[PDB]
């Protein structure tokens, strides 16, 4: 369970000194990355999230307008063009407010949930980088919710359900939730903080979540929730966050017309469920020790012949499986069946179809699994129906 | 047919002076963008392309090693960290060679086709920017093919079929193909250029392509093909390119073991079919004048009630359509049916389901189209089956 070693073994990705802290996603690693996006997008559709894409760099004046310049100028890559200074974005938050600021918003547009798979960059010191855990370039399952003060409870509830629903898919059921203590220096009136804290307390009680408080001084712009998961080694990984913001929407001139026809500043909720998706892939790689679940496996099926007679039967089978949506490969090499089955077992391919002369004549296929289990000859249509169920259900275990 | 005006009318995207030449993709514009990616990925799977993701910035030493530094340093955004200079990538080519350089390659790995939806940036002068046509940040349907000299014909054939197959999906059937004349200053032996030119000439003859030559001096690293399409206004848009490269793989120390067991440098083919996908969306926006085909339309169906009695019937219908994969919205507003049908017609929603008291009791739905055609009451299952066919076929016209 070392994601850097398994990543090299499975040809998932690589890094080199020319771009420290930035991942070269290979084909198989990118397949895992994109399958994660499909999973998140499926959850986004459930909770009615927009998906947007912001610009990678933005004017340094805009970043100074947010107030994040002074606090995080060290971590921000800077670039220039035509006597103007630009910042490679370390966060997606101001860009979403820019999209929100387009057009007039009323209360009828709230809550407005805006998600983005935003590529962000941070100038982290090189000595602190490690694999996919600590990088300079990363993609967050980020989203921001624009809502009234009244909707804070209902929106935090949805984030809470999202965290537990999503972590459970991967097998993470032990979750520790920590709440933040309000600092001395804070933005926003005390009554605003008091009302929002009641919203958070009611939401956490509603979901029956035992929560602890954190010794850290907490964020100045709002109350913060952090979700930590535990992998099969009982290792704690902090991935989720729900951060309230009373500062940024006021700074970036965001507003909406309320029911009373009065100009109001929306409440802004920052939330990520998995956090850094590169980091989450590394966590998943160590969690499964390379035995990725079928829906996450880069190559899900390999079909092999025994000799060249079955080689054309294999090619039809590969096409029939590929049309069914299965990520399949054909192994027609001039190696005998024990060699290929072992090699694809070592590469963690979930299923392995053996096509002998009996298999060609029967119309069936001989099925082996990467754990060495022999499921015997099965109907080709039956095989497809079972993997499709395993893929669509995103099941954690095989047949 | 002005994509900037239609983009504002349909809330597709926006741009602001804080990030000149970079697009804020709104939800509906991002839906078109992502649907284009799915279309390209479907074509990638047909031709057995890998999909990878490279780092956004790379060491300036690596860029100087390519030789693109001296020619294109002006157009490249530069940034630094820890006394080292980095370049925000304007091209995906060197990053793919880096991924190719991982692991030992043999001739049995060739041809190796490597595609990437790579976000690239160029420091284009601000006065030259225009909408999505001329931007600083763009995403290309880029790919690179690593192959032997012998495979150049078969690979150019696949690129040629890809260009015509993909342009035809959008209704672009008039295509002008231009070939490049070899310059005085060139990289690679004359015999290499002579053999590759024969490969290109045979490939273009094979597909029966009438081609012209270009007065431009042509690329120094290899022969170049450019594909121009014509929209419904008979306007020429140059989108596709197939560029041969004898220079870069040798520079970046790329190699493979041949059949003769000799260390050889692969031939590199750069190819993009649509080119800048932001630019292609703008072309598509003007081609359809906002009447996007059903598979490309941001919102494909709107269901409306006449009064609150049908409001709960509409919500079930919206869910049943959404589970079927249709991008659908519910319009339960307190406006009468003529108001809503007109508003969604003005917003170019392909289909429009009207749910009266007759519709609730029958189990059917009243169907209108954005062209004003009345298709009458239809079965809800029948409606779903027809849009699914229209979406999956990517048909250019409605029922
Ligand atoms: C405060 O605004 C906080 N933002 C978030 O925590 C946040 C989490 C998840 C999703 C979104 O959209 C969020 O805004 C803070 O700015 C986080 C942060 C810390 C450090 C740096 N840095 O430049 O080193 C950037 C952002
Ligand atoms: C020559 O290498 C040429 N590259 C391409 O034309 C190309 C087209 C489509 C896909 C890929 O992967 C390609 O490499 C040239 O470098 C193109 C180019 C021109 C200008 C600039 N610029 O920095 O202004 C960059 C790239
Ligand atoms: Zn945020
Ligand atoms: Zn290239």
Residue numbers in the entry:
A (entry chain A), B (entry chain A): 242 to 640
What do the paper's sentences say?
Aminoacyl-tRNA synthetases (AARSs), a family of essential protein synthesis enzymes, are attractive targets for drug development.
Because the length of the side chain of arginine is also not that different from tyrosine, we designed a ThrRS_Y462R mutant. When we cocrystallized ThrRS_Y462R with OB and ATP, we expected that ATP would exclude OB from the active pocket of ThrRS_Y462R if OB failed to form a covalent bond with the enzyme, as we have observed in the ThrRS_Y462F structure. This result indicates that although the activity of the arginine mutant is reduced, it can still react with β-lactone to form a covalent bond over a longer period of time, as it takes approximately 24 h for crystal growth. Another discovery in this study is that β-lactone can modify arginine, although it is not highly reactive.
